[PDB]
């Protein structure tokens, strides 16, 4: 069975487009965003999210992750695609080779 060609259309690497489409009818385009900002402000206002040293280690590792992704993402995607293309080319070559061998026989 062949795989699809694209994934699930995530936004910001965290939330899929299905959520934005699901809130589009009742709360429009800014609905999900005001829900997100409201939840963030309620979390860090009622001190559900306690600001500590882990906030800054979190910001550091998230910055390193976003930078590393934006930088070495094209390279890793192209590397995987080229690995698959080389394997496919080698396989097609080795199939035609045996066809030619039996035709020669």
């Amino acid at each position: 069975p062949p795989l699809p060609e694209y994934g699930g259309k995530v936004r910001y690497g965290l939330i899929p487009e299905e959520f934005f489409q699901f809130l589009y009818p009742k709360t429009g385009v800014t609905g999900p965003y005001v829900l997100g900002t409201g939840l963030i402000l309620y979390a860090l206002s009622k001190e559900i999210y306690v600001i500590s040293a882990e906030t800054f280690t979190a910001l550091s590792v998230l910055g390193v992750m976003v930078y590393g992704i934006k930088k070495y993402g094209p390279f890793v995607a192209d590397f995987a695609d080229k690995l698959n293309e080389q394997k496919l080319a080698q396989l097609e070559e080795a199939k035609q080779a045996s066809i030619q061998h039996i035709q020669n026989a």
Binding site: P4, G7, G8, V10, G13, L14, E47, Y49, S52
Partner: protein, 78 residues
């Protein structure tokens, strides 16, 4: 026709019609894993979002059990 998937079925009896067995919960978790995997990971030309979403859920879980320690670091009292 009470096999209606949740998000389509309004009833509480549906809640008790499900297979709340160890094998049933195992099948439920495995079906969820394969739904996520087929939607986000098991595609060609896939994205890194299928991993960063897992890592975000992991960080949320990690914060959940780290709250009993952080609630002593709150900077207000109410």
């Amino acid at each position: 026709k009470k096999l209606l998937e949740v998000k389509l079925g309004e009833l509480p009896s549906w809640i008790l019609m499900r297979d709340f067995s160890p094998s049933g919960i195992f099948g439920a978790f495995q079906r969820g894993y394969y739904r996520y995997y087929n939607k986000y990971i098991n595609v060609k030309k896939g994205s890194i979002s299928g991993i960063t979403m897992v890592l975000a859920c992991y960080v949320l879980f990690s914060y959940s059990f780290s709250y009993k320690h952080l609630k002593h670091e709150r900077l207000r009292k109410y």
